């Protein structure tokens, strides 16, 4: 299996209504456990999970102190973007972060992560072998050079490489009875006569966690790759996912039709039809 | 934990 | 107080390896950068360690770091009399909320020939 | 991939204004004042984030700084005391990595 520890953070610019909109967000795997918002009525980290509450006060301290150190930064950087692409200070942008590791069954690193982007757009990033970094442009070129020179991707590596991972079997640890439950999908097959004849039949499957599943019409065999359309799969309150997927049959021969879901909190694939 | 800018900034 | 060097005067005659130590107590500390001050000239960087490294060595200059303990020293292997300056070991926290670096009050080297 | 500072030496009567000047060419956005007395250690004066943006270090109390420009970050004197006789670093650096100093200016303030 592969887990992973990462951390999301936008910095938000708006002239004219104070300081630039800070928010970080940490994700154990896709479940977010903690939370900072510089706009909330006390601005400091906050648990978004169960298993994290047990942290000391310590915890959350250091990491707040993070956090607006953090801000900081990314003040800063937000007026030297002005600098660099020449824009006005009238308007409204965006400096997005994601640190983190993905680590194996062993505790071996699988990557590290540790990018930026600008207006929505890839701006730098550490490249895998955790020493180097690749500049989307010209203003970013600036950047790449002055961390080379301040040689910070030492810092970086030693992060991802330690912190990251250690901290991650911690929560792996302390969070397992719900990161690492299971949920199977309960599946249902709906059925819908187009105007034209044909027949829509759609495979349902929901509640189930992770979200990680494999949705399949089939046939006779194992085809159907591009006549079955697809959602992506989306979330509910509970942390549970749904995903639906559906095909074009003629009217009568529904019943050759098949679905079929594969899903770790099964048993065994479900078999479903009309 | 999270990781820091450490004012490294861009 | 926060980041302690010793001794303040170190004499060792060249050839001989110069070991400058250094111990601190903040255990948030993960950076050790060491200064090396000529007389009538500014600091410069000489050589730095991350906390999870227990050994950087650049030529002649190792540090060897001891976090469990909060110590670690400067060894200058082959000394010479050239190497007779200020040396400066100081520390932050990286992850902290300012960017001050925190100055041990330094130890003067003079290598005999 | 220097810091230059301006001038290097001075000498200032006791009550008069002091300005000392600084400059980099390494598009850092932290830089610093420190000063060292003879044989002692670096004690900070200001540290300056951005352009209007500056924090008190160790020992503000006789100083105050300037920050108009990134490239440049000045030190100011209202009123010198001889207690102010000391060597001045300006430093600057890309956050907590190497920190580049000026060659220092030596200023002597006499009766």
């Known amino acids: 299996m592969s887990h992973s520890l990462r951390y999301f953070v936008t910095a938000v610019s708006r002239p004219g209504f104070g300081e630039p909109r800070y928010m970080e967000v940490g994700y154990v795997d896709n479940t977010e456990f903690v939370r900072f918002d510089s706009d909330a009525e006390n601005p400091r980290y906050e648990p978004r999970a169960r298993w994290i509450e047990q942290e000391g006060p310590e915890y959350w301290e250091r990491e707040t102190r993070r956090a607006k150190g953090n801000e900081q930064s990314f003040r800063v950087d937000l007026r030297t973007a002005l600098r660099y692409y020449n824009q006005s200070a009238g308007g409204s942008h965006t400096l997005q972060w994601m640190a983190g590791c993905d680590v194996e069954s062993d505790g071996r690193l699988l990557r590290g992560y540790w990018q930026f982007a600008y207006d929505g757009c890839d701006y730098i990033a550490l490249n895998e072998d955790l020493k180097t970094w690749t500049a989307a442009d010209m203003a970013a070129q600036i950047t790449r050079r002055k961390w080379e020179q301040a040689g910070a991707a030492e810092r970086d590596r030693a992060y991802l490489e330690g912190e990251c991972v250690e901290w991650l079997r911690r929560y792996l640890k302390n969070g397992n009875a719900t990161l690492l439950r299971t949920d199977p999908p309960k599946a249902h097959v709906t059925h819908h006569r187009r105007p034209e004849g044909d027949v829509t039949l759609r495979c349902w499957a929901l509640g189930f966690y992770p979200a990680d599943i494999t949705l399949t019409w089939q046939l006779n065999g194992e085809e159907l790759t591009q006549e079955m359309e697809l959602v992506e799969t989306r979330p509910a309150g509970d942390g549970t996912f749904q995903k639906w997927a559906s095909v074009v049959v003629p009217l009568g021969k529904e019943q050759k039709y098949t679905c079929h879901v594969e899903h770790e909190g099964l048993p065994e694939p479900l078999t479903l039809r009309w | 934990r999270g990781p820091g800018r450490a004012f490294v900034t861009i | 107080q926060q980041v302690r060097q010793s001794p303040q005067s170190l004499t060792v005659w060249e050839g001989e390896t110069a070991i400058l130590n250094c111990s601190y107590e903040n255990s948030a500390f993960d950076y050790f950068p060491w200064y090396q001050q000529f007389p009538g000239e500014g600091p410069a960087l000489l050589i730095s360690?991350?906390?999870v490294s227990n050994k950087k060595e650049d030529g002649r200059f190792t540090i060897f770091f001891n976090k469990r303990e909060k110590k670690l020293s400067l060894h200058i292997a082959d000394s010479q009399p050239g190497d007779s300056a200020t040396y400066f070991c100081?520390?932050?926290?990286?992850?902290?909320?300012?960017?001050?670096?925190?100055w041990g009050l330094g130890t003067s080297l003079v290598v005999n020939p | 991939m220097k810091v230059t500072q301006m001038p290097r030496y001075l000498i200032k009567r006791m009550g008069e204004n002091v300005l000392l000047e600084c400059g980099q060419d390494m598009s850092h956005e932290t830089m610093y004042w420190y000063r060292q007395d003879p044989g002692l250690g670096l004690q900070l004066i200001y540290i300056?984030?951005?352009?209007?943006?500056?924090s008190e270090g160790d020992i503000p109390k006789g100083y105050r700084v300037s920050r108009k420009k990134r490239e440049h970050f000045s030190l100011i004197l209202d009123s010198a005391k001889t207690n102010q006789t000391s060597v001045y670093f300006c430093?600057?650096?890309?956050?907590?990595?190497?920190?580049?100093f000026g060659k220092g200016t030596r200023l002597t303030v006499v009766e």
């Open positions: 100081a520390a932050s926290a990286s992850f902290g909320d300012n960017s001050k670096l925190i």
């Open positions: 430093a600057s650096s890309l956050g907590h990595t190497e920190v580049f």
């Open positions: 360690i991350l906390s």
């Open positions: 300056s984030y951005d352009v209007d943006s500056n």
